């Protein structure tokens, strides 16, 4: 069942691609565009539906469909389970950084100390979040969690996970939130709503609007993935359509790409590989698509490579 995929995501600095499947999970290096080098495979746990690495360390958090309320934290190179924790409901998302691990359930969020896996704080009776929409800053210094503060209005709760206290709620959109992403610094948050007309960027924790990008004329769209380049200069927005928009944070999309496959959610990231900025798109057809961004002039980006997410050649 290595070809029956359940999950794909990038690690915090876009150096690793993780893919979960019925047979287990795999990691791939993103140091080259010409090959997608497998660096690890584990089949000890089947039906892997969440797999989250900590940068390029050996720590991985895993969830299986066979036990969907159970989080396993492992040392993947030693092949050992370090600990596990079971929750009252299905785990919808797991996020981590070097200080904290967050588990999102439909009506609660658990904030763990990643140094000892103790629960430091639980956010209870949240607006129901069956999609598991949330974001966690990857930065060592600005350690914020963002999640929906209403299920009917696009309010963002911003929570400091070191001090264990809220920042200001951001009334980001009238309609409900569809996507959230922090930049690599943790000092900016990108948001989009179900309406999908604009992508907004707010300062964190002050909540001041810094940028507003017209995705385009208003239309039926579900924005699914927002991603910043590591230097914060570019922001990509993808959806269930074929167009990925790349915006440039300066003062019409700066660049666009047309995917060969659409109709479903995808995941994107902006990563510099071999000195060229790239857009990476993981799609529901089982491919990773790799495009080159021209950071000076933008425009239509060329497809350079596609690779099978299941590791096939």
């Amino acid at each position: 069942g290595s070809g029956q995929l359940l999950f794909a995501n990038f690690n915090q600095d876009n150096t690793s691609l993780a893919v979960g499947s019925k047979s287990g999970y795999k990691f791939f290096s993103l140091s080259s565009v010409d090959k997608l080098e497998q660096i690890y495979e584990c089949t000890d746990t089947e039906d892997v539906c969440i797999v989250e690495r900590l940068f390029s360390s050996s720590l991985v958090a895993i969830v299986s469909l066979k036990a969907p309320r159970k989080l396993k934290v492992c040392h993947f190179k030693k092949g050992t389970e370090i600990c596990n924790y079971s929750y009252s409901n299905t785990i919808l998302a797991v996020k981590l950084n070097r200080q904290r691990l967050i588990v999102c359930l439909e009506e609660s969020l658990y904030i763990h100390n990643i140094r000892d896996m103790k629960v430091l704080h639980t956010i209870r009776e949240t607006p129901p979040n069956p999609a598991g929409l949330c974001a966690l800053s990857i930065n060592n210094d600005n350690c914020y969690l963002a999640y929906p503060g209403s299920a009917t209005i696009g309010e963002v709760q911003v929570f400091d996970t070191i001090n264990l206290r809220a920042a200001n709620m951001i009334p980001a959109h009238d309609s409900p939130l569809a996507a959230l992403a922090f930049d690599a610094s943790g000092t900016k948050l990108a948001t989009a709503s179900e309406k999908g007309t604009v992508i907004r960027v707010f300062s964190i924790p002050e909540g001041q609007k810094l940028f507003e990008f017209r995705r385009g004329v208003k239309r039926c769209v579900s924005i699914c993935s927002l991603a910043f380049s590591m230097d914060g200069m570019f922001l990509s927005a993808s959806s269930n359509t074929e167009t990925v928009h790349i915006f440039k944070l300066e003062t019409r999309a700066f660049a666009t790409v047309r995917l060969p496959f659409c109709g479903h959610k995808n995941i994107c990231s902006l990563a510099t590989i071999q000195k060229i900025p790239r857009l990476l798109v993981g799609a529901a057809d089982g491919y990773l698509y790799m495009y080159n961004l021209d950071p000076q002039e933008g425009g239509e980006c060329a497809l350079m490579k596609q690779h099978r997410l299941d590791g096939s050649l």
Binding site: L54, T80, R115
Partner: peptide, 23 residues
């Protein structure tokens, strides 16, 4: 039983720190 819980927690702390080491 509590001294042993502290022993298991010390082991967990050590193992989490080791796994989080980055090259």
């Amino acid at each position: 039983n509590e001294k042993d819980s502290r022993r298991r927690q010390a082991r967990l702390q050590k193992e989490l720190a080791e796994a989080a080491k980055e090259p």
